Coordinates of all heavy atoms in Angstrom, one line a residue:
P1 N -30.0 -23.3 2.5 CA -29.6 -24.1 3.7 C -28.3 -24.7 3.4 O -27.6 -25.1 4.4 CB -30.8 -25.2 3.7 CG -31.9 -24.6 3.1 CD -31.4 -23.7 1.9
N2 N -27.9 -24.9 2.2 CA -26.6 -25.7 1.9 C -25.4 -24.8 1.5 O -24.4 -25.3 1.4 CB -26.9 -26.7 0.8 CG -28.2 -27.5 0.8 OD1 -28.4 -28.3 1.5 ND2 -29.2 -26.8 0.1
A3 N -25.8 -23.5 1.4 CA -24.7 -22.5 1.1 C -23.6 -22.6 2.1 O -23.8 -22.9 3.4 CB -25.3 -21.2 0.9
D4 N -22.4 -22.4 1.7 CA -21.1 -22.1 2.5 C -21.3 -20.9 3.4 O -21.7 -19.9 3.0 CB -19.9 -21.9 1.5 CG -18.7 -21.4 2.2 OD1 -18.7 -21.1 3.3 OD2 -17.6 -21.7 1.7
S5 N -21.0 -21.1 4.7 CA -21.3 -20.0 5.8 C -20.6 -18.7 5.5 O -21.1 -17.7 5.7 CB -20.8 -20.6 7.1 OG -21.0 -21.9 7.3
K6 N -19.4 -18.8 4.7 CA -18.7 -17.7 4.3 C -19.3 -16.8 3.1 O -19.2 -15.7 2.9 CB -17.3 -17.9 4.0 CG -16.4 -18.5 5.2 CD -15.9 -19.9 4.8 CE -14.7 -19.7 3.8 NZ -14.2 -18.2 4.0
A7 N -20.0 -17.6 2.3 CA -20.6 -17.0 1.2 C -22.0 -16.2 1.8 O -22.2 -15.0 1.4 CB -21.1 -18.0 0.3
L8 N -22.6 -17.0 2.6 CA -23.9 -16.4 3.2 C -23.5 -15.2 4.0 O -24.3 -14.2 4.0 CB -24.5 -17.4 4.3 CG -25.8 -18.0 3.7 CD1 -25.8 -18.1 2.2 CD2 -25.9 -19.4 4.3
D9 N -22.3 -15.1 4.7 CA -21.9 -13.9 5.5 C -21.6 -12.7 4.6 O -21.8 -11.7 4.8 CB -20.7 -14.3 6.4 CG -20.2 -13.1 7.2 OD1 -20.8 -12.7 8.1 OD2 -19.1 -12.7 6.8
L10 N -20.9 -13.0 3.5 CA -20.6 -12.1 2.5 C -22.0 -11.6 1.8 O -22.1 -10.3 1.6 CB -19.6 -12.5 1.4 CG -19.3 -11.5 0.2 CD1 -18.9 -10.2 0.7 CD2 -18.2 -12.1 -0.7
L11 N -22.8 -12.4 1.5 CA -24.2 -12.1 1.1 C -24.9 -11.1 2.0 O -25.4 -10.1 1.5 CB -25.0 -13.4 0.8 CG -26.5 -13.3 0.3 CD1 -26.5 -12.6 -1.0 CD2 -27.1 -14.7 0.3
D12 N -24.9 -11.3 3.3 CA -25.4 -10.5 4.3 C -24.9 -9.1 4.1 O -25.6 -8.2 4.2 CB -25.2 -11.0 5.8 CG -25.9 -10.3 6.8 OD1 -27.3 -10.2 6.7 OD2 -25.3 -9.6 7.7
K13 N -23.5 -9.0 4.0 CA -22.9 -7.7 4.0 C -23.2 -7.0 2.8 O -23.0 -5.7 2.5 CB -21.4 -7.9 4.2 CG -21.1 -8.1 5.7 CD -19.8 -8.9 5.7 CE -19.4 -9.4 7.1 NZ -18.7 -10.7 7.0
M14 N -23.4 -7.7 1.5 CA -23.7 -7.0 0.3 C -25.3 -6.6 0.2 O -25.6 -5.6 -0.5 CB -23.5 -7.9 -0.8 CG -22.1 -8.6 -0.7 SD -21.6 -9.4 -2.3 CE -21.2 -7.9 -3.1
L15 N -26.2 -7.3 0.8 CA -27.6 -7.0 0.8 C -27.9 -6.5 2.2 O -28.8 -7.0 2.8 CB -28.4 -8.3 0.6 CG -28.3 -9.1 -0.8 CD1 -29.1 -10.3 -0.8 CD2 -28.6 -8.2 -2.1
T16 N -27.3 -5.3 2.5 CA -27.7 -4.6 3.7 C -28.6 -3.4 3.2 O -28.3 -2.7 2.2 CB -26.7 -4.0 4.6 OG1 -26.3 -2.6 4.1 CG2 -25.4 -4.9 4.4
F17 N -29.7 -3.2 3.8 CA -30.8 -2.1 3.5 C -30.2 -0.8 3.5 O -30.4 0.0 2.6 CB -31.9 -2.2 4.5 CG -33.0 -1.3 4.1 CD1 -34.2 -1.8 3.2 CD2 -33.1 0.0 4.5 CE1 -35.1 -1.0 3.0 CE2 -34.1 0.9 4.1 CZ -35.2 0.3 3.4
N18 N -29.3 -0.5 4.5 CA -28.7 0.8 4.5 C -27.5 0.9 3.6 O -26.5 0.2 3.8 CB -28.3 1.2 6.0 CG -27.9 2.7 6.1 OD1 -27.4 3.3 5.2 ND2 -27.9 3.1 7.3
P19 N -27.5 1.7 2.5 CA -26.4 1.8 1.7 C -25.1 2.2 2.3 O -24.0 1.6 2.0 CB -26.8 2.9 0.7 CG -27.9 3.6 1.2 CD -28.6 2.6 2.0
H20 N -25.1 3.1 3.3 CA -24.0 3.6 4.1 C -23.3 2.3 4.8 O -22.1 2.4 5.1 CB -24.4 4.7 5.0 CG -24.8 5.8 4.2 ND1 -26.2 6.5 4.4 CD2 -24.3 6.5 3.1 CE1 -26.3 7.4 3.5 NE2 -25.2 7.6 2.9
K21 N -24.0 1.4 5.3 CA -23.5 0.4 5.9 C -23.2 -0.8 5.1 O -22.8 -1.9 5.6 CB -24.5 -0.2 7.2 CG -24.8 0.8 8.2 CD -26.0 0.4 9.1 CE -26.5 1.5 9.8 NZ -28.0 1.3 10.1
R22 N -23.2 -0.6 3.9 CA -23.0 -1.7 2.9 C -21.5 -1.9 2.5 O -20.8 -1.0 2.3 CB -23.9 -1.5 1.7 CG -24.0 -2.6 0.8 CD -25.1 -2.4 -0.3 NE -26.5 -2.2 0.2 CZ -27.2 -1.2 -0.4 NH1 -26.7 -0.6 -1.6 NH2 -28.3 -0.9 0.1
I23 N -21.2 -3.2 2.4 CA -19.8 -3.5 2.1 C -19.4 -2.9 0.8 O -20.0 -2.8 -0.1 CB -19.6 -5.0 2.1 CG1 -18.1 -5.3 2.1 CG2 -20.2 -5.7 1.1 CD1 -17.7 -6.7 2.6
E24 N -18.1 -2.4 0.7 CA -17.6 -1.9 -0.5 C -16.6 -2.8 -1.3 O -16.6 -3.8 -0.8 CB -16.7 -0.6 -0.2 CG -17.3 0.6 0.4 CD -16.3 1.6 1.1 OE1 -15.4 1.2 1.8 OE2 -16.5 2.9 1.1
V25 N -16.3 -2.4 -2.6 CA -15.8 -3.4 -3.5 C -14.4 -4.0 -3.0 O -14.2 -5.2 -3.0 CB -15.6 -2.9 -4.9 CG1 -14.5 -1.8 -5.1 CG2 -15.4 -4.1 -5.8
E26 N -13.4 -3.1 -2.5 CA -12.3 -3.6 -1.8 C -12.5 -4.4 -0.7 O -11.8 -5.5 -0.5 CB -11.3 -2.5 -1.5 CG -10.3 -2.1 -2.6 CD -10.6 -0.8 -3.4 OE1 -11.6 -0.2 -3.0 OE2 -9.9 -0.4 -4.2
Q27 N -13.5 -4.0 0.2 CA -13.7 -4.8 1.4 C -14.2 -6.3 1.0 O -13.7 -7.3 1.5 CB -14.7 -4.2 2.2 CG -14.1 -3.0 3.0 CD -15.1 -2.1 3.4 OE1 -16.3 -2.1 3.2 NE2 -14.8 -1.0 4.2
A28 N -15.2 -6.3 0.1 CA -15.7 -7.6 -0.4 C -14.6 -8.5 -1.0 O -14.7 -9.6 -0.6 CB -16.9 -7.3 -1.4
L29 N -13.9 -8.1 -1.9 CA -12.7 -8.7 -2.3 C -11.9 -9.4 -1.3 O -11.3 -10.6 -1.4 CB -11.8 -7.9 -3.3 CG -12.2 -7.8 -4.7 CD1 -11.6 -6.7 -5.4 CD2 -12.1 -9.0 -5.4
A30 N -11.8 -8.7 -0.2 CA -11.1 -9.1 1.0 C -11.7 -9.8 1.9 O -11.2 -10.4 2.9 CB -10.4 -7.9 1.6
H31 N -12.9 -10.3 1.7 CA -13.7 -11.2 2.5 C -13.3 -12.4 2.6 O -12.7 -12.9 1.5 CB -15.3 -11.1 2.2 CG -16.1 -11.7 3.1 ND1 -16.3 -13.1 3.3 CD2 -17.1 -11.3 4.0 CE1 -17.1 -13.4 4.1 NE2 -17.6 -12.4 4.6
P32 N -13.3 -13.2 3.7 CA -12.8 -14.5 3.8 C -13.4 -15.5 2.8 O -12.7 -16.6 2.5 CB -13.2 -15.0 5.3 CG -13.1 -13.6 5.8 CD -13.7 -12.6 5.0
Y33 N -14.5 -15.3 2.1 CA -15.1 -16.2 1.2 C -14.2 -16.2 0.0 O -14.2 -17.1 -0.8 CB -16.5 -15.7 0.8 CG -17.1 -16.6 -0.1 CD1 -17.3 -18.0 0.2 CD2 -17.7 -16.3 -1.3 CE1 -17.8 -18.9 -0.7 CE2 -18.3 -17.2 -2.2 CZ -18.3 -18.4 -1.8 OH -18.9 -19.4 -2.8
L34 N -13.3 -15.2 -0.3 CA -12.7 -15.1 -1.7 C -11.2 -15.1 -1.3 O -10.4 -14.5 -2.2 CB -13.1 -13.7 -2.2 CG -14.6 -13.5 -2.6 CD1 -14.8 -12.1 -3.1 CD2 -15.2 -14.6 -3.4
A35 N -10.7 -15.5 -0.2 CA -9.3 -15.5 0.2 C -8.4 -16.1 -0.9 O -7.3 -15.7 -1.0 CB -9.2 -16.1 1.6
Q36 N -8.8 -17.4 -1.4 CA -8.0 -18.0 -2.4 C -7.7 -17.3 -3.7 O -6.5 -17.4 -4.2 CB -8.6 -19.3 -2.7 CG -10.1 -19.5 -2.6 CD -10.7 -20.8 -2.8 OE1 -10.0 -21.8 -3.2 NE2 -12.1 -20.8 -2.9
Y37 N -8.6 -16.3 -4.1 CA -8.4 -15.6 -5.3 C -7.9 -14.2 -5.0 O -7.4 -13.5 -5.8 CB -9.6 -15.7 -6.1 CG -10.1 -17.1 -6.3 CD1 -11.1 -17.6 -5.6 CD2 -9.6 -17.8 -7.4 CE1 -11.6 -18.8 -5.9 CE2 -9.9 -19.0 -7.7 CZ -11.1 -19.6 -7.0 OH -11.5 -20.9 -7.2
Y38 N -8.0 -13.8 -3.7 CA -7.8 -12.4 -3.3 C -6.2 -12.0 -3.6 O -5.2 -12.8 -3.2 CB -8.1 -12.1 -1.9 CG -7.8 -10.7 -1.5 CD1 -8.2 -9.7 -2.5 CD2 -7.5 -10.3 -0.3 CE1 -8.1 -8.4 -2.0 CE2 -7.4 -9.0 0.0 CZ -7.6 -8.0 -0.9 OH -7.5 -6.7 -0.5
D39 N -6.0 -11.0 -4.5 CA -4.7 -10.7 -4.9 C -4.6 -9.3 -5.3 O -4.9 -9.0 -6.5 CB -4.2 -11.6 -5.9 CG -2.6 -11.5 -6.3 OD1 -1.9 -10.7 -5.6 OD2 -2.1 -12.5 -6.9
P40 N -4.5 -8.3 -4.5 CA -4.5 -6.9 -4.8 C -3.4 -6.5 -5.9 O -3.6 -5.6 -6.7 CB -4.0 -6.2 -3.6 CG -4.2 -7.0 -2.5 CD -4.6 -8.6 -3.0
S41 N -2.3 -7.3 -6.0 CA -1.3 -7.0 -7.0 C -1.6 -7.4 -8.5 O -1.2 -6.9 -9.3 CB 0.1 -7.7 -6.6 OG -0.1 -9.2 -6.5
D42 N -2.5 -8.5 -8.4 CA -3.1 -8.8 -9.7 C -4.7 -8.6 -9.7 O -5.4 -9.3 -10.0 CB -2.9 -10.3 -10.0 CG -3.3 -10.8 -11.4 OD1 -3.2 -9.9 -12.2 OD2 -3.9 -11.8 -11.6
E43 N -5.1 -7.3 -9.3 CA -6.3 -6.8 -9.3 C -6.2 -5.4 -9.8 O -6.3 -4.5 -9.0 CB -7.0 -6.9 -8.0 CG -7.5 -8.3 -7.7 CD -7.9 -8.6 -6.3 OE1 -8.0 -7.7 -5.5 OE2 -8.1 -9.9 -6.0
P44 N -6.2 -5.1 -11.1 CA -5.9 -3.8 -11.7 C -7.0 -2.8 -11.5 O -8.2 -3.2 -11.2 CB -5.9 -4.1 -13.2 CG -5.7 -5.6 -13.3 CD -6.4 -6.2 -12.1
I45 N -6.6 -1.4 -11.4 CA -7.3 -0.4 -11.0 C -7.1 0.7 -12.3 O -6.1 0.7 -12.9 CB -6.7 0.3 -9.7 CG1 -7.4 -0.4 -8.5 CG2 -6.6 1.8 -9.7 CD1 -7.8 0.6 -7.5
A46 N -8.2 1.4 -12.5 CA -8.1 2.4 -13.5 C -7.0 3.3 -13.4 O -6.6 3.7 -12.3 CB -9.3 3.2 -13.6
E47 N -6.5 3.9 -14.5 CA -5.4 5.0 -14.5 C -5.9 6.2 -14.0 O -5.2 7.0 -13.2 CB -4.7 5.0 -15.9
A48 N -7.1 6.7 -14.3 CA -7.6 7.9 -13.8 C -9.2 7.7 -13.9 O -9.7 6.8 -14.5 CB -7.3 9.0 -14.9

């Protein structure tokens, strides 16, 4: 009941029953709950 509305919203998108409708990693990073830390340029990706 006391959780931040944006966390709960991201939670809803991560715990969706249908895997196909489920939020992906890049999308989740970009969710408004994580806006302060969101930084694609300092978020490294594998070489291969």
Side-chain angles (χ1 to χ4, degrees), residues 1-46 48:
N2 321 278
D4 174 335
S5 323
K6 295 124 74 19
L8 254 26
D9 181 72
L10 176 53
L11 181 60
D12 188 58
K13 290 158 190 138
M14 313 191 76
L15 299 177
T16 94
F17 187 96
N18 191 337
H20 301 123
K21 296 172 201 152
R22 196 173 301 142
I23 190 162
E24 291 162 324
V25 71
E26 267 105 3
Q27 292 161 352
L29 275 165
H31 191 282
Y33 183 54
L34 307 178
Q36 25 186 1
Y37 304 102
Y38 187 35
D39 198 345
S41 63
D42 190 37
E43 281 165 11
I45 270 231

